[PDB]
Design a protein around this nucleic acid. Structure first.
Ligand SMILES: [Mg+2]
Ligand SMILES: [Mg+2]
Ligand SMILES: [Mg+2]
Ligand SMILES: [Mg+2]
Ligand SMILES: [Mg+2]
Ligand SMILES: [Mg+2]
Ligand SMILES: [Mg+2]
Ligand SMILES: [Mg+2]
Ligand SMILES: [Mg+2]
Ligand SMILES: [Mg+2]
Ligand SMILES: [Mg+2]
Ligand SMILES: [Mg+2]
Ligand SMILES: [Mg+2]
Ligand SMILES: [Mg+2]
Ligand SMILES: [Mg+2]
Ligand SMILES: [Mg+2]
Ligand SMILES: [Mg+2]
Ligand SMILES: [Mg+2]
Ligand SMILES: [Mg+2]
Ligand SMILES: [Mg+2]
Ligand SMILES: [Mg+2]
Ligand SMILES: [Mg+2]
Ligand SMILES: [Mg+2]
Ligand SMILES: [Mg+2]
Ligand SMILES: [Mg+2]
Ligand SMILES: [Mg+2]
Ligand SMILES: [Mg+2]
Lengths: 96, 107, 67, 57, 223
RNA sequence: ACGGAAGGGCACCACCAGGAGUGGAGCCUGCGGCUUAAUUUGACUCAACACGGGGAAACUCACCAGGUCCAGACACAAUAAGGAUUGACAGAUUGAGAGCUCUUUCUUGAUUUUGUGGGUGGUGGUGCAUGGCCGUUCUUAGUUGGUGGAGUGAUUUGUCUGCUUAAUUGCGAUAACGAACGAGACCUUAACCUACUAAAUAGUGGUGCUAGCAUUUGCUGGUUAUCCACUUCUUAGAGGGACUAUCGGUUUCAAGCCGAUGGAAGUUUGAGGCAAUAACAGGUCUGUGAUGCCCUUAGACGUUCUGGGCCGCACGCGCGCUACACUGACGGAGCCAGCGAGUCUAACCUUGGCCGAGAGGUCUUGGUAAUCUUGUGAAACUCCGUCGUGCUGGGGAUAGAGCAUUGUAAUUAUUGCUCUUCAACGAGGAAUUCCUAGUAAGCGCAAGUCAUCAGCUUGCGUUGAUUACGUCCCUGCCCUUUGUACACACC
């Protein structure tokens, strides 16, 4: 989609560190819970990220449940130029 | 050394009477079994949430009406106890289905 | 109509069949009898059964009944 | 499926549950990359990575 | 916070309704079934009753950590105020939902229709069921609609024991042609009812008398 | 399976016996039809027509007049840092403070543009491609299997003349015996507990504190804690109770049925929930991010914004509301329910105090609730008056002028109040609906919908009948008997 690169970073970053993203089906939000971009920006971003593999999308009761895949793990590994063995939601928390 | 009489009120609400009463009966026998001082389970009117629909998703047919309901049963019991047993009484007696709520005080 | 279903009748056969010593022209005791002697899931079905075993015992008294 | 080939359906079905029981019985006993996400941006937070100057006329 | 009690329990219900949906959508290829929700002091404890738990846990625990994050980020819990747990269902041969999901996966895997459905029954019955039943409505291979009954064993259909004793499920399974509806019906043996009535109300059992050796003119025993 | 053959049955979506009506009138409301820029559309015997929860001012929205945007994933290719592309102030322009477009000339920086491919949305078509759901048959009583009997076999007997029941409910007959699904059992609700466990979120008696009237003690109140006791009423856990009991008529003295006594209760205890096999080209793609295939996809059938329309009016149809008055209208005055609902990251249910003729305004206030609204002091109703049979003060359509509330908006008048205007309708032709006891009928209320709007619906309680307690005449269906050249089954 058409959107400024800064806002792409905000999403790509947040997805990487969290490994998961959510979003109510409601374009016209202009700012969604957490991530500081337009909601429409969020949804279509991943919708691309998904339609080129990388991440999976689910729906149910109006809320787009975004699961990042291993193949997309390597891809955000690229975007954010961060090293192999970087991160994602793949740490066993504390002793949790 | 600690302890102080607190004048307490535990309010039990749920839609599963058997467990609800299982937890309610549990509270009173257990706590009186070690001598407190109380008002026994107070049953406020079981209240009945009706929902009244047409069966048809569409429009046509004998206009058959259907009415679902959900029964909310609510108890409460007042206890005078030390600080210890209260917390001992709230953390346990737990039950998936019964809404335990522990209030306090004289206002 | 107050026609008794097959279960009620069938079970009233069986009872008189195997418990004529004990049982009586009295419902009430036959009712209590049915408890300590058989297993019926609902209070209703039980007196349904006792009431009709009590019928049959009361007319067996004045000549047999087929069954 | 026609009632003609009926038998071999039921049998293929039977033997299907033979496999369904097999796996359901052999599943009754059968047989770290850190740095973190916010701790690698805080670790690479030793700066020297920008520039700033303007404002005139 | 501070919500009405009426609206609270109604609300509580919907929360479960959404949860059971979302999981049913996500954990199909893991034999998902129900979700026992359990709120505590400290936590809310969702317990996922699948069949293939290792395929829910994932690499040293990764996928449940996703699903929590999911269910967290949406229902706005604070991190670690809500927890998830896998829980292999006690014998799937009596959980309609698991059996439906099968026929879906069966049919969807080019399985002969009478084969899938018949075997599905032959596995439920073999899982010690009192009776079972599979409707396949829809349309296959040819244009017209058709449906089939597939049933072995003993069922009941009316009144309250329904509630107690029969599991029902429907699942739309969607193929290259259209969509056909799977409906599964299992009858559990009332004997093992555990927490409930232990028979059909239908049932009347007579305790079986005793050979009596009568006679014996009086006499007494002293102690 | 079907008949425009025969014999049986069942039922207030059938009659009988009656009640209350509709059909006539004014308006409310749907449907047709006409009109229209558009008047979005499904559905047309029971089983379409106050139905799509369909009460549309925007939205809803699908229709009509026009104006924006891509939210056109992804792949390849093209353009292209000498800038692929993005935005706009003013002006013009436009319904519009849309940079839509244009002038003019900055900005932006690889996000897009362009092309093909591939997608994508759509209340676009297809319910005669499907799921699912629902309606109907069905206010019905039917379906099946073991062992035995018959048959080469499909099959049949069981599953039947009769009687009985609401019921393939039973008795009885009996080449059948003995069982299961469905009916019944079950479940929910309304009735009965001075027995059981309790209650300042329910209530009683005593006592204090106290008011009024009598005074001889008495009587009617006040006082969310001044204390004591109780659990009849209220609430809800647990049990109990009923099984058509007892007695008696009656019938194959069988199932049953009828009467009397008793009983809270004796019509399946009243009322529901649930409900087998099967059938339909019943309805629903306009509930669904359920869905096949077709269609469409940047001058869009996507979406959104501005305005109109769904309410348009010679007329045909259906559900309704209100009446034609004296068992009434009006005015005082008495004064009595039950099912409900109600405000968090909010403006819901609202007491009381003023102001106002009213509608309403305003200041506070209790309530996330058996705790506050609310004893919901509801309406018919009861009483004491006024009017006197006159379209009358019955009736209140239509209409003028005014004041308010909801809402961004009220014109085609959202609704509310005041004055005025005061129509038809004097009991409704042929037709036709519903109904058997706390029922019918009259009467309000709460909930749905809902910013505002009920003449609708779903439940509720209040007042409370006349007539059946029969039948097969009308109609509908069910069952045997029978014919079949039907089996895609008389479409
Ligand atoms: Mg039943
Ligand atoms: Mg008549
Ligand atoms: Mg008449
Ligand atoms: Mg519009
Ligand atoms: Mg293209
Ligand atoms: Mg159809
Ligand atoms: Mg259909
Ligand atoms: Mg059509
Ligand atoms: Mg009737
Ligand atoms: Mg033979
Ligand atoms: Mg026959
Ligand atoms: Mg049954
Ligand atoms: Mg009492
Ligand atoms: Mg009497
Ligand atoms: Mg059709
Ligand atoms: Mg549909
Ligand atoms: Mg659609
Ligand atoms: Mg309309
Ligand atoms: Mg109608
Ligand atoms: Mg008048
Ligand atoms: Mg009056
Ligand atoms: Mg004034
Ligand atoms: Mg307050
Ligand atoms: Mg007049
Ligand atoms: Mg209302
Ligand atoms: Mg309506
Ligand atoms: Mg023939």
């Amino acid at each position: 989609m058409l959107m400024p690169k800064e806002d792409r970073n905000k999403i790509h970053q947040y997805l990487f560190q969290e490994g998961v993203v959510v979003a109510k089906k409601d374009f016209n939000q202009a700012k969604h819970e957490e991530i500081d971009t337009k909601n429409l920006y969020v949804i279509k971003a991943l919708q691309s990220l998904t339609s080129k593999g990388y991440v999976k999308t689910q729906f149910s009761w109006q809320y787009y449940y975004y699961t990042l895949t291993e193949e997309g793990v390597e891809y955000l590994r690229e975007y954010l130029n961060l090293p192999e063995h970087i991160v994602p939601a793949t740490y066993i928390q504390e002793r949790n | 050394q600690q302890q102080q009489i607190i004048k307490i009120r535990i309010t039990l609400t749920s839609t599963k009477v058997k467990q609800l009463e299982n937890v309610s009966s549990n509270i009173v026998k257990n706590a009186e079994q070690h001598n407190l001082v109380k008002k026994g389970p107070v049953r406020l009117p079981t209240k009945v949430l009706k929902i009244s629909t047409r069966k048809t998703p569409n429009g046509e047919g004998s206009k058959t009406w259907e009415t679902y309901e959900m029964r909310i049963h609510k108890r409460y019991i007042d206890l005078e106890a030390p600080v210890q047993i209260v917390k001992r009484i709230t953390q346990i007696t737990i039950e998936p289905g019964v809404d335990v709520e522990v209030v306090v005080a004289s206002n | 109509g107050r026609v008794r279903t097959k279960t009620v009748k069938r079970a009233s056969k069986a009872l008189i069949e195997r418990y004529y010593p004990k049982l009586t022209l009295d419902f009430q005791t036959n009712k209590r009898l049915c408890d300590e002697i058989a297993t019926i899931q609902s209070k209703r079905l039980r007196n349904k059964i006792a009431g009709y075993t009590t019928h049959l015992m009361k007319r067996i008294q004045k000549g047999p009944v087929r069954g | 499926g026609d009632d003609k080939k009926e038998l071999s359906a039921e049998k293929e079905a039977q033997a299907d549950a033979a496999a369904e029981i097999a796996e359901d019985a052999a599943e009754a006993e059968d047989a770290l990359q850190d740095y973190l996400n916010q701790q690698a941006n805080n670790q690479f937070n030793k700066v020297p990575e920008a520039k700033k100057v303007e404002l005139d006329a | 916070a501070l919500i009405s009690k009426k609206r609270k329990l109604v609300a509580d219900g919907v929360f479960y309704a959404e949860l059971n949906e979302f999981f049913t959508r996500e954990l199909a290829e893991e034999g998902y079934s129900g979700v026992e929700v359990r709120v505590t002091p400290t936590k809310t404890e969702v317990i996922i009753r699948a069949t293939r738990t290792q395929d829910v846990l994932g690499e040293n625990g990764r996928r449940i950590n996703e699903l929590t994050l999911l269910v967290q980020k949406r229902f706005k819990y604070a991190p670690g105020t809500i927890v998830l747990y896998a829980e292999r269902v006690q014998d799937r041969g009596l959980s309609a939902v698991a059996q439906a999901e099968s026929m879906k996966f069966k049919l969807l895997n080019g399985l002969a229709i009478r084969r899938a459905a018949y075997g599905v029954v032959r596995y439920v019955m073999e899982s010690g069921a009192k009776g079972c039943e599979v409707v396949v409505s829809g349309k296959l291979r040819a244009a017209r609609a058709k449906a089939m009954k597939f049933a072995d064993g003993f069922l009941i259909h009316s009144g309250q024991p329904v509630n107690d004793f029969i599991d029902t499920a429907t699942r739309h399974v969607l193929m290259r042609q259209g969509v056909l509806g799977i409906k599964v019906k299992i009858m559990r043996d009332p004997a093992k009812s555990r927490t409930g009535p232990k028979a059909l109300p239908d049932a009347v059992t007579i305790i079986e008398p005793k050979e009596e050796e009568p006679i014996l003119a009086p006499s007494v025993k002293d102690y």
